[PDB]
Amino acid sequence: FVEMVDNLRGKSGQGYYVEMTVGSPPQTLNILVDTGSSNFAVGAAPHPFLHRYYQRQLSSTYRDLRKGVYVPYTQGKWEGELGTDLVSIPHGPNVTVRANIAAITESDKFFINGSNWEGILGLAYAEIARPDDSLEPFFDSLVKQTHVPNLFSLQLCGASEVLASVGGSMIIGGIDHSLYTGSLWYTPIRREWYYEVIIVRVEINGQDLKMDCKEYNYDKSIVDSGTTNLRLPKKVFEAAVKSIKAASSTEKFPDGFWLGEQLVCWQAGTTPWNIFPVISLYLMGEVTNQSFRITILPQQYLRPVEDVATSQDDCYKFAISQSSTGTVMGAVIMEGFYVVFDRARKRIGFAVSACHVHDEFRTAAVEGPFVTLDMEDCGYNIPQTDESRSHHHH
Ligand SMILES: N#Cc1ccc(COC(=O)[C@H]2C[C@]3(CN2)C(=O)Nc2ccccc23)cc1Br
Numbered sequence: 001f002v003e004m005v006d007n008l009r010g011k012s013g014q015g016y017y018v019e020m021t022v023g024s025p026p027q028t029l030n031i032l033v034d035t036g037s038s039n040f041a042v043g044a045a046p047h048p049f050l051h052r053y054y055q056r057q058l059s060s061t062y063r064d065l066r067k068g069v070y071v072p073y074t075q076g077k078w079e080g081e082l083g084t085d086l087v088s089i090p091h092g093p094n095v096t097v098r099a100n101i102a103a104i105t106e107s108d109k110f111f112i113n114g115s116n117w118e119g120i121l122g123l124a125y126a127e128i129a130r131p132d133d134s135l136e137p138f139f140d141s142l143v144k145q146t147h148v149p150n151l152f153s154l155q156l157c158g159a160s161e162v163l164a165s166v167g168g169s170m171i172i173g174g175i176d177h178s179l180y181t182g183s184l185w186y187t188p189i190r191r192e193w194y195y196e197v198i199i200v201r202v203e204i205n206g207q208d209l210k211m212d213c214k215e216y217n218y219d220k221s222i223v224d225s226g227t228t229n230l231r232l233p234k235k236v237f238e239a240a241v242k243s244i245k246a247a248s249s250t251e252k253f254p255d256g257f258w259l260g261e262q263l264v265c266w267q268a269g270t271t272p273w274n275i276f277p278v279i280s281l282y283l284m285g286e287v288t289n290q291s292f293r294i295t296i297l298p299q300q301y302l303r304p305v306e307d308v309a310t311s312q313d314d315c316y317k318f319a320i321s322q323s324s325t326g327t328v329m330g331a332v333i334m335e336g337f338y339v340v341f342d343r344a345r346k347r348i349g350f351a352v353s354a355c356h357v358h359d360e361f362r363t364a365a366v367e368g369p370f371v372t373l374d375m376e377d378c379g380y381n382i383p384q385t386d387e388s389r390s391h392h393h394h
């Protein structure tokens with residue numbers, strides 16, 4: 001899998017993308033890797049934040065499906081025309097695939113200035129594809145038309161006039177042992193829509209938040225490469241920030257720091273890492289009553305920004321933020337770990353990433369098992385709307 005190592009790039013906080021080609025002759029585009037969605041969609045007209053876009057009419061292998069699509073996120077949305085075309089990943093498997101593509105014709109708060117990506121590769125399950133689940137997602141087509149094992153793995157690697165470049169690896173069809181150290185621990189996928197998981201416990205510097213564990217997963221917990229922060233439900237975020245504030249309390253930062261809206265700075269090289277606590281999320285294990293923990297450092301949740309006007313200083317953004325749609329284990333989490341999306345066995349694996357940023361006293365850690373007897377149920381059941389209830393699935 002050496003040809004797939006280091007095949008992701010991006011700018012810190014603005015998404016990891018992989019190079020893809022669509023069409024005949026091949027049009028090259030930089031495509032966000034997003035495990036929180038299941039559509040393959042590409043900028044298909046001019047836009048202030050796009051260097052280039054997909055030109056359907058210039059591909060002899062394009063086919064229009066004569067159907068529109070609309071996807072609204074919490075932040076951002078887009079619409080497009082559905083079609084299929086030939087797609088390859090030059091630093092991926094040695095295959096070409098006919099896949100669904102949404103040509104994005106309009107959008108708002110979707111594309112990001114300076115990010116260098118022009119589309120999105122949705123790697124989650126058909127259940128949340130748009131307009132509905134009969135639009136085969138890309139990975140499904142890849143596995144179906146080729147010999148590629150139904151699994152991929154992501155190593156996202158952390159970081160004055162530009163933001164920091166980041167690099168990473170997306171290994172399509174397996175697991176590269178150079179990319180992690182020590183044990184690889186798996187947590188069941190609760191349901192194949194998002195990559196949904198269940199957190200059974202949260203510790204800040206070894207101290208239990210002591211919340212009803214249903215609160216950790218209200219209204220869901222998902223692993224999303226296409227989300228920058230660790231995002232936490234309102235009540236969880238408030239307790240977690242209270243604990244981190246407490247530990248770090250020799251430094252009094254402005255409100256805007258903790259809201260994720262302001263940098264704080266120390267003189268080059270003098271950041272007091274050791275006043276910030278480690279955060280451990282315990283995930284449901286494969287075995288009943290077992291769990292394992294993934295522990296991240298302040299090096300992951302304190303995200304570095306080089307300020308033009310204080311470029312002498314090491315400056316950081318707080319990259320834990322509030323959610324009203326559940327826990328999102330985003331890049332902040334993932335940059336600790338080599339994360340294995342084992343679709344075949346309906347599980348997600350975590351191991352310590354051979355590229356995670358640490359210091360001489362503490363590392364990100366993946367550790368288990370831990371055991372509870374009569375371990376309760378920590379899952380939440382999303383209220384079912386009449387809209388969702390009325391849909392037939394033939
Ligand atoms: N109908 C629907 C529907 C609603 C919500 C979701 C949630 O989608 C995510 O979380 C993806 C998309 C993401 C980050 N990851 C985002 O939220 N804004 C944004 C902006 C730019 C790039 C990636 C993203 C998925 C579906 Br499908």
Ligand SMILES: [Zn+2]
Pocket residue numbers: 392393394
């Ligand atoms: Zn029907």
